[PDB]
Amino acid sequence: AVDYSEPIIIKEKGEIKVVKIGELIDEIIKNSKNVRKDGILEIARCKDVEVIAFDSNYKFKFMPVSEVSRHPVSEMFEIVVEGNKKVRVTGSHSVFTVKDNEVVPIRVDDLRVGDILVLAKELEKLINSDFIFLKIKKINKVEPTNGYAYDLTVPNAENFIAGFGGFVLHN
């Protein structure tokens, strides 16, 4: 449920890089051994690869990705926030918002302009977090670059960030 072209920061066998998520995943699937093609999602196990996710103190750290997935898709939403930062994602998938001073998932097709979204930096808990909270400018649905949406499974966290602005995504 993220577009081919959205970038992510990973660590692969110990080295950091910025990759397009679809290139990373196509490649991984392409050179694995036992891809699971069962449905309209293809799934593959991956190794030596980590992503940035927030922990229970709301702080970022690199964490292993167990497996990756993709699926053909006809639609995609673009979300723009304060600062003209954006990401393209599936309307079914989830990001985070604030409510009662804790961050909480919220599904994308339930979003509305002027709600507060959580992204990466740069209620004592909120203050100490690596988050910023920005309001939605507009949300303009669109078509998917390489008609394929992508995802990651991140054990012990169930989140990760992606997009130039480091939008936080929920599994």
Side-chain angles (χ1 to χ4, degrees):
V2 24
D3 189 71
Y4 183 84
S5 51
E6 296 295 344
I8 44 173
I9 304 177
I10 71 180
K11 199 139 67 74
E12 197 188 330
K13 333 194 163 204
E15 46 170 349
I16 289 157
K17 53 181 124 286
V18 186
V19 308
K20 317 262 205 83
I21 185 169
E23 160 200 66
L24 179 65
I25 281 171
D26 291 5
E27 199 232 341
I28 287 159
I29 285 174
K30 208 227 185 218
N31 45 31
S32 87
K33 311 283 179 227
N34 304 322
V35 169
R36 344 283 177 188
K37 304 164 201 284
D38 227 17
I40 54 256
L41 263 83
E42 294 179 89
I43 295 100
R45 205 195 63 76
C46 54
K47 189 205 250 163
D48 305 339
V49 167
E50 298 177 280
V51 109
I52 302 151
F54 74 81
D55 71 13
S56 65
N57 296 315
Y58 293 169
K59 300 291 306 181
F60 294 136
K61 81 168 181 275
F62 272 95
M63 300 268 232
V65 176
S66 47
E67 35 145 46
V68 295
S69 66
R70 74 190 174 177
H71 63 275
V73 75
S74 81
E75 284 210 317
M76 205 105 273
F77 300 173
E78 190 176 45
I79 310 186
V80 194
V81 292
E82 209 147 49
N84 216 7
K85 299 166 144 72
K86 43 182 172 148
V87 66
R88 310 224 231 138
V89 281
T90 283
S92 81
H93 189 254
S94 18
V95 306
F96 286 86
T97 192
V98 178
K99 193 72 181 329
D100 294 341
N101 305 152
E102 268 172 284
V103 303
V104 83
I106 204 77
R107 10 192 334 286
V108 165
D109 44 29
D110 292 298
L111 285 173
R112 74 209 108 171
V113 174
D115 246 67
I116 271 152
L117 287 194
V118 191
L119 299 81
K121 256 183 188 44
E122 285 174 292
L123 101 127
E124 286 103 0
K125 200 200 189 150
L126 282 191
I127 289 177
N128 292 26
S129 73
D130 298 330
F131 305 141
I132 55 172
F133 311 98
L134 289 185
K135 341 164 107 315
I136 302 146
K137 194 114 79 185
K138 55 142 171 42
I139 55 185
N140 213 149
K141 70 290 189 282
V142 79
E143 85 195 334
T145 107
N146 169 35
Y148 254 6
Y150 289 93
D151 227 291
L152 306 169
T153 297
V154 187
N156 303 304
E158 282 69 40
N159 74 76
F160 68 99
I161 73 193
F164 283 111
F167 278 92
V168 187
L169 276 22
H170 182 60
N171 278 351

mmCIF file of all heavy atoms in Angstrom, residues 45-82:
data_model
loop_
_atom_site.group_PDB
_atom_site.id
_atom_site.type_symbol
_atom_site.label_atom_id
_atom_site.label_comp_id
_atom_site.label_asym_id
_atom_site.label_seq_id
_atom_site.Cartn_x
_atom_site.Cartn_y
_atom_site.Cartn_z
ATOM 1 N N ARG A 45 10.274 -13.292 1.717
ATOM 2 C CA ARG A 45 11.021 -13.096 2.928
ATOM 3 C C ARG A 45 12.266 -12.340 2.542
ATOM 4 O O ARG A 45 12.770 -12.549 1.467
ATOM 5 C CB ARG A 45 11.364 -14.433 3.581
ATOM 6 C CG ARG A 45 11.576 -14.288 5.067
ATOM 7 C CD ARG A 45 12.263 -15.495 5.670
ATOM 8 N NE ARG A 45 13.611 -15.728 5.147
ATOM 9 C CZ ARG A 45 14.711 -15.045 5.474
ATOM 10 N NH1 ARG A 45 14.683 -14.032 6.341
ATOM 11 N NH2 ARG A 45 15.871 -15.386 4.926
ATOM 12 N N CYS A 46 12.722 -11.429 3.402
ATOM 13 C CA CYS A 46 13.999 -10.729 3.182
ATOM 14 C C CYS A 46 14.825 -10.688 4.445
ATOM 15 O O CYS A 46 14.348 -10.931 5.541
ATOM 16 C CB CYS A 46 13.799 -9.328 2.594
ATOM 17 S SG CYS A 46 12.692 -8.234 3.491
ATOM 18 N N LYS A 47 16.104 -10.430 4.243
ATOM 19 C CA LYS A 47 17.139 -10.590 5.263
ATOM 20 C C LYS A 47 18.116 -9.440 5.096
ATOM 21 O O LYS A 47 18.193 -8.856 4.025
ATOM 22 C CB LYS A 47 17.844 -11.916 4.973
ATOM 23 C CG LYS A 47 18.848 -12.457 6.007
ATOM 24 C CD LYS A 47 19.865 -13.391 5.354
ATOM 25 C CE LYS A 47 19.691 -14.862 5.748
ATOM 26 N NZ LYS A 47 20.416 -15.765 4.814
ATOM 27 N N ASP A 48 18.924 -9.198 6.119
ATOM 28 C CA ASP A 48 19.990 -8.199 6.039
ATOM 29 C C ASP A 48 19.468 -6.734 5.802
ATOM 30 O O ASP A 48 20.201 -5.900 5.287
ATOM 31 C CB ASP A 48 21.050 -8.581 4.947
ATOM 32 C CG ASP A 48 21.655 -9.984 5.126
ATOM 33 O OD1 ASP A 48 21.591 -10.526 6.248
ATOM 34 O OD2 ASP A 48 22.199 -10.538 4.130
ATOM 35 N N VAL A 49 18.208 -6.446 6.105
ATOM 36 C CA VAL A 49 17.598 -5.193 5.711
ATOM 37 C C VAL A 49 16.797 -4.602 6.864
ATOM 38 O O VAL A 49 16.004 -5.277 7.491
ATOM 39 C CB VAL A 49 16.676 -5.397 4.489
ATOM 40 C CG1 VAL A 49 15.769 -4.166 4.263
ATOM 41 C CG2 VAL A 49 17.520 -5.675 3.254
ATOM 42 N N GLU A 50 16.992 -3.328 7.133
ATOM 43 C CA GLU A 50 16.298 -2.672 8.213
ATOM 44 C C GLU A 50 15.781 -1.348 7.805
ATOM 45 O O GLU A 50 16.319 -0.718 6.918
ATOM 46 C CB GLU A 50 17.230 -2.434 9.374
ATOM 47 C CG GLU A 50 17.778 -3.704 9.966
ATOM 48 C CD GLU A 50 18.746 -3.404 11.060
ATOM 49 O OE1 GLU A 50 19.905 -3.086 10.724
ATOM 50 O OE2 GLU A 50 18.345 -3.476 12.238
ATOM 51 N N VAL A 51 14.779 -0.894 8.546
ATOM 52 C CA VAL A 51 14.065 0.301 8.247
ATOM 53 C C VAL A 51 13.894 1.101 9.523
ATOM 54 O O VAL A 51 13.974 0.559 10.603
ATOM 55 C CB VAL A 51 12.763 -0.159 7.567
ATOM 56 C CG1 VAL A 51 11.516 0.017 8.383
ATOM 57 C CG2 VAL A 51 12.673 0.423 6.172
ATOM 58 N N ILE A 52 13.661 2.385 9.386
ATOM 59 C CA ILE A 52 13.412 3.235 10.541
ATOM 60 C C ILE A 52 11.946 3.182 11.000
ATOM 61 O O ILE A 52 11.018 3.421 10.212
ATOM 62 C CB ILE A 52 13.808 4.716 10.229
ATOM 63 C CG1 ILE A 52 15.284 4.800 9.835
ATOM 64 C CG2 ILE A 52 13.678 5.592 11.440
ATOM 65 C CD1 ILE A 52 15.523 5.952 8.896
ATOM 66 N N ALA A 53 11.785 2.858 12.294
ATOM 67 C CA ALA A 53 10.481 2.711 12.943
ATOM 68 C C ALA A 53 10.555 3.314 14.287
ATOM 69 O O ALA A 53 11.609 3.370 14.868
ATOM 70 C CB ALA A 53 10.144 1.276 13.101
ATOM 71 N N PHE A 54 9.429 3.786 14.797
ATOM 72 C CA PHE A 54 9.432 4.326 16.129
ATOM 73 C C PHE A 54 9.138 3.274 17.145
ATOM 74 O O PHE A 54 8.369 2.365 16.890
ATOM 75 C CB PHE A 54 8.468 5.466 16.241
ATOM 76 C CG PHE A 54 7.013 5.070 16.276
ATOM 77 C CD1 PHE A 54 6.404 4.613 17.485
ATOM 78 C CD2 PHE A 54 6.218 5.270 15.195
ATOM 79 C CE1 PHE A 54 5.072 4.280 17.539
ATOM 80 C CE2 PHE A 54 4.875 5.032 15.265
ATOM 81 C CZ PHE A 54 4.311 4.481 16.430
ATOM 82 N N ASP A 55 9.704 3.474 18.319
ATOM 83 C CA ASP A 55 9.663 2.571 19.423
ATOM 84 C C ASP A 55 8.597 3.059 20.397
ATOM 85 O O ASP A 55 7.892 4.032 20.151
ATOM 86 C CB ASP A 55 11.074 2.411 20.031
ATOM 87 C CG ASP A 55 11.596 3.655 20.797
ATOM 88 O OD1 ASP A 55 10.822 4.597 21.096
ATOM 89 O OD2 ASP A 55 12.782 3.715 21.232
ATOM 90 N N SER A 56 8.470 2.391 21.533
ATOM 91 C CA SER A 56 7.403 2.682 22.469
ATOM 92 C C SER A 56 7.554 4.037 23.203
ATOM 93 O O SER A 56 6.553 4.578 23.704
ATOM 94 C CB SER A 56 7.331 1.550 23.479
ATOM 95 O OG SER A 56 8.509 1.516 24.253
ATOM 96 N N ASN A 57 8.782 4.564 23.258
ATOM 97 C CA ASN A 57 9.028 5.990 23.561
ATOM 98 C C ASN A 57 8.861 6.997 22.427
ATOM 99 O O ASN A 57 9.115 8.184 22.631
ATOM 100 C CB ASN A 57 10.419 6.142 24.116
ATOM 101 C CG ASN A 57 10.562 5.432 25.413
ATOM 102 O OD1 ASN A 57 9.688 5.538 26.263
ATOM 103 N ND2 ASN A 57 11.637 4.728 25.587
ATOM 104 N N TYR A 58 8.369 6.551 21.278
ATOM 105 C CA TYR A 58 8.160 7.417 20.130
ATOM 106 C C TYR A 58 9.465 7.943 19.519
ATOM 107 O O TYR A 58 9.464 9.012 18.908
ATOM 108 C CB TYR A 58 7.191 8.578 20.449
ATOM 109 C CG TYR A 58 5.746 8.285 20.726
ATOM 110 C CD1 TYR A 58 4.928 9.303 21.246
ATOM 111 C CD2 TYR A 58 5.169 7.010 20.477
ATOM 112 C CE1 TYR A 58 3.578 9.069 21.539
ATOM 113 C CE2 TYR A 58 3.818 6.777 20.760
ATOM 114 C CZ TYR A 58 3.046 7.809 21.320
ATOM 115 O OH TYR A 58 1.722 7.637 21.582
ATOM 116 N N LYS A 59 10.536 7.159 19.655
ATOM 117 C CA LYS A 59 11.825 7.472 19.109
ATOM 118 C C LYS A 59 12.177 6.515 17.992
ATOM 119 O O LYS A 59 11.931 5.330 18.103
ATOM 120 C CB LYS A 59 12.867 7.322 20.183
ATOM 121 C CG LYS A 59 12.670 8.217 21.403
ATOM 122 C CD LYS A 59 12.902 9.701 21.125
ATOM 123 C CE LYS A 59 14.290 9.943 20.487
ATOM 124 N NZ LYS A 59 14.549 11.389 20.234
ATOM 125 N N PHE A 60 12.810 7.029 16.946
ATOM 126 C CA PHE A 60 13.245 6.268 15.830
ATOM 127 C C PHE A 60 14.473 5.419 16.104
ATOM 128 O O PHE A 60 15.333 5.731 16.959
ATOM 129 C CB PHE A 60 13.512 7.160 14.625
ATOM 130 C CG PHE A 60 12.287 7.824 14.074
ATOM 131 C CD1 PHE A 60 12.329 9.142 13.729
ATOM 132 C CD2 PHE A 60 11.115 7.137 13.897
ATOM 133 C CE1 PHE A 60 11.200 9.794 13.202
ATOM 134 C CE2 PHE A 60 9.982 7.747 13.421
ATOM 135 C CZ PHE A 60 10.021 9.088 13.067
ATOM 136 N N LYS A 61 14.420 4.250 15.481
ATOM 137 C CA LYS A 61 15.567 3.337 15.425
ATOM 138 C C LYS A 61 15.425 2.346 14.258
ATOM 139 O O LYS A 61 14.321 2.093 13.727
ATOM 140 C CB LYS A 61 15.825 2.646 16.766
ATOM 141 C CG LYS A 61 14.983 1.442 17.123
ATOM 142 C CD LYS A 61 15.655 0.779 18.350
ATOM 143 C CE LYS A 61 14.955 -0.488 18.862
ATOM 144 N NZ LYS A 61 13.801 -0.310 19.832
ATOM 145 N N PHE A 62 16.569 1.890 13.788
ATOM 146 C CA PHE A 62 16.600 0.972 12.644
ATOM 147 C C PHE A 62 16.145 -0.356 13.168
ATOM 148 O O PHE A 62 16.563 -0.735 14.243
ATOM 149 C CB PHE A 62 17.985 0.879 12.011
ATOM 150 C CG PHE A 62 18.216 1.919 10.962
ATOM 151 C CD1 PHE A 62 18.867 3.145 11.249
ATOM 152 C CD2 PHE A 62 17.759 1.717 9.710
ATOM 153 C CE1 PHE A 62 19.061 4.083 10.265
ATOM 154 C CE2 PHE A 62 17.918 2.665 8.724
ATOM 155 C CZ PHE A 62 18.598 3.836 9.012
ATOM 156 N N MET A 63 15.238 -0.997 12.446
ATOM 157 C CA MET A 63 14.676 -2.285 12.836
ATOM 158 C C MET A 63 14.529 -3.247 11.650
ATOM 159 O O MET A 63 14.156 -2.828 10.522
ATOM 160 C CB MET A 63 13.290 -2.056 13.359
ATOM 161 C CG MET A 63 13.238 -1.156 14.552
ATOM 162 S SD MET A 63 13.340 -2.317 15.872
ATOM 163 C CE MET A 63 11.888 -1.687 16.694
ATOM 164 N N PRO A 64 14.700 -4.564 11.905
ATOM 165 C CA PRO A 64 14.677 -5.521 10.779
ATOM 166 C C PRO A 64 13.319 -5.621 10.112
ATOM 167 O O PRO A 64 12.287 -5.483 10.767
ATOM 168 C CB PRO A 64 15.053 -6.855 11.414
ATOM 169 C CG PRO A 64 15.422 -6.584 12.776
ATOM 170 C CD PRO A 64 14.687 -5.288 13.175
ATOM 171 N N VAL A 65 13.351 -5.826 8.801
ATOM 172 C CA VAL A 65 12.178 -6.137 8.009
ATOM 173 C C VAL A 65 12.197 -7.628 7.793
ATOM 174 O O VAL A 65 13.175 -8.162 7.289
ATOM 175 C CB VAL A 65 12.248 -5.453 6.629
ATOM 176 C CG1 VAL A 65 11.049 -5.878 5.771
ATOM 177 C CG2 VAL A 65 12.250 -3.946 6.776
ATOM 178 N N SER A 66 11.113 -8.294 8.139
ATOM 179 C CA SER A 66 11.021 -9.749 7.975
ATOM 180 C C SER A 66 10.662 -10.131 6.564
ATOM 181 O O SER A 66 11.282 -11.054 5.978
ATOM 182 C CB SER A 66 9.957 -10.284 8.932
ATOM 183 O OG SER A 66 8.789 -9.476 8.843
ATOM 184 N N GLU A 67 9.651 -9.459 6.023
ATOM 185 C CA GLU A 67 9.193 -9.727 4.639
ATOM 186 C C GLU A 67 8.589 -8.516 3.925
ATOM 187 O O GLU A 67 8.180 -7.548 4.534
ATOM 188 C CB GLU A 67 8.160 -10.873 4.612
ATOM 189 C CG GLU A 67 7.233 -10.914 5.818
ATOM 190 C CD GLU A 67 5.832 -11.367 5.509
ATOM 191 O OE1 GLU A 67 5.704 -12.375 4.797
ATOM 192 O OE2 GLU A 67 4.875 -10.708 5.973
ATOM 193 N N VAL A 68 8.523 -8.615 2.604
ATOM 194 C CA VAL A 68 8.043 -7.553 1.732
ATOM 195 C C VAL A 68 6.946 -8.098 0.851
ATOM 196 O O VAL A 68 6.865 -9.281 0.677
ATOM 197 C CB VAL A 68 9.185 -6.977 0.853
ATOM 198 C CG1 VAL A 68 10.217 -6.298 1.739
ATOM 199 C CG2 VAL A 68 9.845 -8.039 -0.048
ATOM 200 N N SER A 69 6.130 -7.212 0.281
ATOM 201 C CA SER A 69 4.960 -7.573 -0.493
ATOM 202 C C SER A 69 4.677 -6.525 -1.536
ATOM 203 O O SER A 69 5.103 -5.400 -1.394
ATOM 204 C CB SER A 69 3.722 -7.740 0.414
ATOM 205 O OG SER A 69 3.285 -6.531 1.050
ATOM 206 N N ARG A 70 3.973 -6.923 -2.597
ATOM 207 C CA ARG A 70 3.398 -6.008 -3.560
ATOM 208 C C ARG A 70 2.095 -6.531 -4.161
ATOM 209 O O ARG A 70 1.834 -7.699 -4.142
ATOM 210 C CB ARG A 70 4.399 -5.766 -4.679
ATOM 211 C CG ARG A 70 4.556 -6.940 -5.633
ATOM 212 C CD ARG A 70 5.725 -6.725 -6.569
ATOM 213 N NE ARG A 70 5.969 -7.903 -7.388
ATOM 214 C CZ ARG A 70 6.895 -8.009 -8.344
ATOM 215 N NH1 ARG A 70 7.694 -7.008 -8.643
ATOM 216 N NH2 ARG A 70 7.054 -9.147 -8.981
ATOM 217 N N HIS A 71 1.320 -5.625 -4.719
ATOM 218 C CA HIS A 71 0.076 -5.969 -5.345
ATOM 219 C C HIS A 71 -0.326 -4.956 -6.363
ATOM 220 O O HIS A 71 -0.165 -3.758 -6.098
ATOM 221 C CB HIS A 71 -1.078 -6.273 -4.366
ATOM 222 C CG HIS A 71 -1.542 -5.172 -3.463
ATOM 223 N ND1 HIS A 71 -0.929 -4.895 -2.255
ATOM 224 C CD2 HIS A 71 -2.668 -4.417 -3.489
ATOM 225 C CE1 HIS A 71 -1.602 -3.948 -1.623
ATOM 226 N NE2 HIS A 71 -2.665 -3.645 -2.348
ATOM 227 N N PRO A 72 -0.808 -5.422 -7.538
ATOM 228 C CA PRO A 72 -1.390 -4.507 -8.535
ATOM 229 C C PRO A 72 -2.534 -3.668 -7.958
ATOM 230 O O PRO A 72 -3.244 -4.092 -7.032
ATOM 231 C CB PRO A 72 -1.900 -5.440 -9.648
ATOM 232 C CG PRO A 72 -1.289 -6.788 -9.401
ATOM 233 C CD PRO A 72 -0.805 -6.829 -7.987
ATOM 234 N N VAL A 73 -2.687 -2.475 -8.507
ATOM 235 C CA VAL A 73 -3.541 -1.480 -7.914
ATOM 236 C C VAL A 73 -3.857 -0.464 -8.986
ATOM 237 O O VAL A 73 -3.009 -0.191 -9.848
ATOM 238 C CB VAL A 73 -2.790 -0.823 -6.732
ATOM 239 C CG1 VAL A 73 -1.705 0.157 -7.224
ATOM 240 C CG2 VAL A 73 -3.742 -0.183 -5.741
ATOM 241 N N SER A 74 -5.079 0.065 -8.954
ATOM 242 C CA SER A 74 -5.575 1.001 -9.985
ATOM 243 C C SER A 74 -5.564 2.443 -9.507
ATOM 244 O O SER A 74 -5.371 3.369 -10.318
ATOM 245 C CB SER A 74 -6.994 0.603 -10.441
ATOM 246 O OG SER A 74 -8.020 1.044 -9.551
ATOM 247 N N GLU A 75 -5.760 2.627 -8.197
ATOM 248 C CA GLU A 75 -5.795 3.942 -7.583
ATOM 249 C C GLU A 75 -4.659 4.153 -6.570
ATOM 250 O O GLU A 75 -3.960 3.225 -6.214
ATOM 251 C CB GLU A 75 -7.172 4.169 -6.956
ATOM 252 C CG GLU A 75 -8.244 4.473 -7.992
ATOM 253 C CD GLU A 75 -9.359 5.364 -7.473
ATOM 254 O OE1 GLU A 75 -9.823 5.139 -6.319
ATOM 255 O OE2 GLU A 75 -9.784 6.272 -8.237
ATOM 256 N N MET A 76 -4.476 5.411 -6.173
ATOM 257 C CA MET A 76 -3.540 5.829 -5.121
ATOM 258 C C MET A 76 -3.963 7.231 -4.667
ATOM 259 O O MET A 76 -4.404 8.019 -5.494
ATOM 260 C CB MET A 76 -2.099 5.848 -5.660
ATOM 261 C CG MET A 76 -1.000 5.669 -4.618
ATOM 262 S SD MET A 76 -0.207 4.052 -4.590
ATOM 263 C CE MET A 76 -1.295 3.123 -3.480
ATOM 264 N N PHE A 77 -3.844 7.536 -3.371
ATOM 265 C CA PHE A 77 -4.081 8.894 -2.850
ATOM 266 C C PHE A 77 -2.749 9.608 -2.676
ATOM 267 O O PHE A 77 -1.783 9.025 -2.212
ATOM 268 C CB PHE A 77 -4.802 8.889 -1.500
ATOM 269 C CG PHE A 77 -6.170 8.219 -1.492
ATOM 270 C CD1 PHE A 77 -6.833 8.033 -0.285
ATOM 271 C CD2 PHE A 77 -6.802 7.772 -2.657
ATOM 272 C CE1 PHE A 77 -8.094 7.449 -0.212
ATOM 273 C CE2 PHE A 77 -8.051 7.153 -2.589
ATOM 274 C CZ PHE A 77 -8.695 6.989 -1.355
ATOM 275 N N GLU A 78 -2.687 10.871 -3.067
ATOM 276 C CA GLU A 78 -1.575 11.720 -2.693
ATOM 277 C C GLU A 78 -2.023 12.574 -1.520
ATOM 278 O O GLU A 78 -3.095 13.153 -1.561
ATOM 279 C CB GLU A 78 -1.147 12.605 -3.842
ATOM 280 C CG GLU A 78 0.164 13.314 -3.565
ATOM 281 C CD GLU A 78 0.670 14.128 -4.719
ATOM 282 O OE1 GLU A 78 -0.143 14.867 -5.330
ATOM 283 O OE2 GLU A 78 1.885 14.020 -5.004
ATOM 284 N N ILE A 79 -1.210 12.637 -0.476
ATOM 285 C CA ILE A 79 -1.509 13.492 0.663
ATOM 286 C C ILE A 79 -0.459 14.581 0.695
ATOM 287 O O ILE A 79 0.739 14.269 0.629
ATOM 288 C CB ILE A 79 -1.462 12.746 1.975
ATOM 289 C CG1 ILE A 79 -2.295 11.480 1.842
ATOM 290 C CG2 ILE A 79 -1.978 13.660 3.096
ATOM 291 C CD1 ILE A 79 -2.470 10.683 3.123
ATOM 292 N N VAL A 80 -0.937 15.825 0.798
ATOM 293 C CA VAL A 80 -0.093 16.983 0.990
ATOM 294 C C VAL A 80 -0.350 17.599 2.360
ATOM 295 O O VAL A 80 -1.533 17.743 2.769
ATOM 296 C CB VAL A 80 -0.392 18.068 -0.058
ATOM 297 C CG1 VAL A 80 0.730 19.100 -0.060
ATOM 298 C CG2 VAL A 80 -0.558 17.430 -1.432
ATOM 299 N N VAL A 81 0.741 17.953 3.052
ATOM 300 C CA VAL A 81 0.648 18.666 4.334
ATOM 301 C C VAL A 81 1.377 20.000 4.325
ATOM 302 O O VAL A 81 2.229 20.275 3.439
ATOM 303 C CB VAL A 81 1.168 17.826 5.551
ATOM 304 C CG1 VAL A 81 0.234 16.640 5.832
ATOM 305 C CG2 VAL A 81 2.613 17.372 5.374
ATOM 306 N N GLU A 82 1.014 20.827 5.313
ATOM 307 C CA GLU A 82 1.785 22.039 5.709
ATOM 308 C C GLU A 82 3.269 21.896 5.382
ATOM 309 O O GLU A 82 3.922 21.054 5.936
ATOM 310 C CB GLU A 82 1.595 22.275 7.220
ATOM 311 C CG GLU A 82 1.675 23.726 7.718
ATOM 312 C CD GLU A 82 0.745 23.980 8.901
ATOM 313 O OE1 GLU A 82 0.803 23.159 9.843
ATOM 314 O OE2 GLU A 82 -0.030 24.976 8.884
#
